[PDB]
């Protein structure tokens, strides 16, 4: 089913944008949903948010994480997929959380292969394309 996958960071930068053949909103609307809100306490954690936008008949679901315990700055892995697989999605969720977590791992691997605090944005990084894969034949075809 169609799917957009974004990955950014804040410093924000984008590190990947993915639109699948099969499927938008803008990146400065969307960097407000991912890293933008009254209604939840922010604790400085790792976290999931799921979130309807409306205005497009889509939702949003994203893992955002800290590099590590000192670090002040976020990683996020969002996905955009039609609201009607909200119930699917919900449904499946302790599946996708787990499959979030690799991702996670693997990013947060990258990070530690190259003493760094970022990821590319011009990414042959196999971490990256893990990431992207693990949406494209374990997270998306669960959601249909």
């Keep these: 089913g169609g799917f957009r996958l974004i990955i ?5 930068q984008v590190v990947l944008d ?8 803008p990146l400065n609307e969307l960097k407000d949903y991912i890293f933008g809100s009254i209604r939840t306490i922010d604790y400085s954690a790792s976290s999931d948010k799921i ?7 889509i ?6 994480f800290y590099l590590n315990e000192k670090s002040t700055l976020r990683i996020a892995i969002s996905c955009c997929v039609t ?5 699917v999605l919900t449904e499946c969720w302790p599946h996708i ?6 991702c996670e791992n693997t990013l947060l691997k ?3 292969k190259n003493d760094t605090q970022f990821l590319p944005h011009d990414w042959n990084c196999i971490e990256v394309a893990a990431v992207l894969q693990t949406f494209q034949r374990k997270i ?4 249909s």
Aim: aromatic residues 12%.
């Design 8 to 12: 950014s960071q804040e410093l924000y």
């Design 18 to 25: 993915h639109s699948s053949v099969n499927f938008h909103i």
């Design 51 to 57: 979130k309807v936008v409306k205005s497009a008949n």
């Design 59 to 64: 939702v949003l679901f994203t893992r955002i």
């Design 83 to 87: 609201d009607d697989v909200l119930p």
């Design 97 to 102: 959380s787990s499959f979030l977590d690799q």
């Design 110 to 112: 990258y990070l530690a």
């Design 140 to 143: 998306i075809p669960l959601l």
